[PDB]
Design a binder for this molecule. Structure first.
Ligand SMILES: [Zn+2]
Lengths: 383, 254
């Protein structure tokens, strides 16, 4: 909202690397941002890297969307068309470079045809964007890429698409995700550059150490260039968007709890959470319950929205126990969390027998051993 | 080379010859003759014709010894290959030979002086115009009909598999480069007739036409069991093949 607006302003005063990034929901925010831009810059349909066959280059995908946009802006109302197919064919012909698992020599004389020397696909792409903005009468093109949480590996590829092809001043990148995975993947295939025999032989702490230093420094430096900090976006969180304990509350959220909910029955968001917990927790309205719900307002918006949408849903269903309607919701919310916790899974074996053993397991895993039975969500792990 | 060599040899033997060398010459010439007879009365050797040397030779022969081409309109008939790659290799060979032939007679801005892809070749060629000094090429793929095999769903099913394969290859090149249609003008179905009757090809010819193949040709009347049989073949071809005005059949010896 406000965040997307500042971001819009930031990219706008950028045409005057060239890659804004959004930490982190994420997709909703990015879609809203793109709607915002609809100082002439033309946007691209959002790029979902995880939603692409294992064999495409980000560049081919970009070329496809660009093809559509150019062609239809062209069928709207020539020689510009005629000029475009030349670049298109040049791209097709030089396209092999990326795919080819081996160099075929015939590509040599191919490279011998005719402004840097060779068949630079990146320069070809730059004339491509030149033609595109020349024809669309736009200052630049936005390339909008989705997070790669579902496939953090394909993202690397977009990174090289950027580095090798998007070092142009009429293109701007909008990346989204967690830079931690970026770091890992870039590191992972940094390590892949070494020679297998090398590490196979030098398996000693000393040399392990300095190569780790080298790889980590290179990862850091390369992330610096690819994602220069200035244009990165931190984004405001839901609890950051909500009063910590009531001494805040820029832009009250308010949520719907009943089907009627004629915009005046909205029971805040913090207050709805507190009711759900206290009554499902039989928790009183004291300080710990508050902080309990603060350690709830962290959770990712999807998880919290599901867990608080199945809460009142089933309460209304039963009303035409709060703790069990809420317990069933927590079960779905943390199931794989609880599943990897190694704790009771079957629902037909609830009892109070399994509860004591499971509490023992939780306290041992949280270490503690002093107030673990308090079951405070104070652990470092979100699991 | 052979011309010059034999000329010199004969000159040296103008008055006489060593009988041994002369026996060598009989045997040489005879071997030539019988090998040649075998050849005429008749794959890899043809594949060896897949360079822009044989076709350039063909074109230089087609053109006379004079400045103007002895022939006007040439038909370039070629065997289709089941591989897209072999197909395109052959096509590029033919096209480059033709372009070089034309260049050897006309001077003009060739865009790609040393073309390397069929696209570049057509880029060169489209600048050519029909003055008539050189030959005008028209290209046609052969369809070879083989005897039906022992077991299959229906007669000539496998042969039809192969032919549809070749045809798909062809239409897909046409798609990729529509400009060739100015050059691949018609498709012909040749070879010994009894191995397959024409109707096997009517859908093939129809789909090819819709692909954009103007013209169609089919050998007929050449060889047959009975003269009536050949006549029947020819007429059925007439009444079945998607042949339009001006199309041409072939031998029709019946
Ligand atoms: Zn014939």
């Amino acid at each position: 909202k406000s965040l997307r607006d500042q971001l819009v302003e930031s990219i706008r005063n950028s045409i005057a690397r060239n890659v804004f990034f959004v930490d982190g929901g994420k997709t909703t925010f990015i879609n809203s941002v793109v709607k915002s831009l609809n100082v002439n810059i033309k946007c691209l349909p959002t790029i979902d890297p995880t939603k692409l066959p294992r064999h495409e280059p980000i560049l081919v995908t970009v070329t496809a969307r660009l093809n559509k946009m150019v062609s239809d802006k062209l069928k709207g109302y020539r020689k510009q068309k005629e000029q475009w197919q030349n670049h298109l064919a040049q791209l097709q012909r030089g396209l092999h470079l990326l795919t080819d698992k081996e160099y075929k020599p015939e590509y040599f004389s191919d490279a011998l045809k005719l402004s840097i020397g060779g068949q630079d696909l990146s320069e070809i792409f730059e004339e491509l964007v030149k033609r595109a903005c020349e024809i669309l009468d736009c200052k630049a093109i936005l390339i909008t890429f989705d997070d790669i949480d579902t496939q953090f590996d394909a993202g690397w590829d977009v990174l090289e698409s950027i580095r090798k092809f998007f070092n142009s001043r009429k293109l701007v990148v909008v990346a989204t995700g967690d830079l931690r995975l970026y770091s890992q993947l870039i590191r992972g295939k940094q390590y892949e550059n070494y020679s297998k025999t090398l590490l196979e032989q030098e398996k000693e702490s000393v040399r392990l150490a300095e190569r780790g230093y080298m790889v980590e420094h290179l990862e850091q430096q390369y992330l610096l260039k690819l994602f220069p900090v200035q244009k990165r976006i931190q984004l405001k969180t839901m609890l950051q968007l909500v009063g910590e304990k009531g001494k805040a509350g820029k832009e009250e959220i308010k949520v719907k709890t009943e089907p009627s909910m004629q915009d005046i029955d909205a029971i805040d968001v913090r207050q709805a959470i507190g009711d759900a917990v206290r009554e499902g927790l039989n928790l009183r309205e004291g300080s710990d319950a508050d902080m309990y719900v603060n350690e709830l307002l962290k959770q990712p918006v999807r998880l919290l929205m599901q867990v608080l949408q199945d809460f009142y849903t089933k309460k209304y269903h039963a009303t035409s126990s709060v703790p069990n309607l809420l317990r069933n919701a927590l079960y779905g919310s943390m199931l794989s969390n609880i599943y990897r916790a190694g704790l009771n899974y079957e629902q037909h074996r609830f009892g109070m027998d399994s509860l004591c053993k499971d509490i023992f397991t939780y306290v041992k895993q949280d270490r503690d051993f002093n107030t673990g039975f308090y079951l405070r969500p104070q652990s470092e792990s979100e699991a | 080379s052979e011309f010059c060599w034999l000329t010199g040899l004969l000159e040296k033997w103008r008055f006489n010859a060593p009988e041994g060398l002369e026996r060598l010459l009989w045997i040489y010439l005879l071997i030539q003759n019988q090998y040649l007879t075998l050849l005429v009365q008749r794959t890899m050797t043809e594949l060896r014709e897949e360079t822009e040397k044989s076709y350039l030779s063909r074109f230089k022969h087609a053109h006379g010894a004079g400045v103007y081409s002895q022939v006007r309109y040439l038909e370039g008939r070629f065997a289709p290959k089941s591989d897209p790659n072999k197909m395109q290799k052959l096509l590029f060979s033919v096209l480059r030979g033709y372009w070089e032939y034309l260049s050897a007679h006309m001077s003009m801005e060739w865009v790609h002086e040393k073309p390397l892809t069929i696209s570049q070749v057509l880029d060169n060629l489209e600048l050519v115009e029909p003055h008539g000094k050189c030959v005008e090429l028209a290209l046609v793929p052969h369809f070879i009909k083989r005897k039906p095999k022992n077991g299959e769903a229906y007669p000539h099913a496998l042969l039809f598999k192969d032919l549809k394969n070749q045809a798909a290859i062809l239409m897909d090149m046409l798609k990729s480069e529509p400009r060739l249609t100015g050059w691949i003008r018609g498709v012909d179905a040749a070879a010994n007739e009894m191995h397959a009757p024409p109707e096997l090809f009517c859908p093939l010819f129809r789909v090819l036409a819709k692909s954009g193949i103007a013209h169609f040709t089919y050998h007929v009347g050449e060889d047959f069991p009975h003269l009536i049989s050949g006549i029947r073949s020819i007429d059925d071809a007439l009444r079945f093949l998607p042949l339009r005005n001006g199309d041409r059949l072939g031998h029709c010896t019946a």
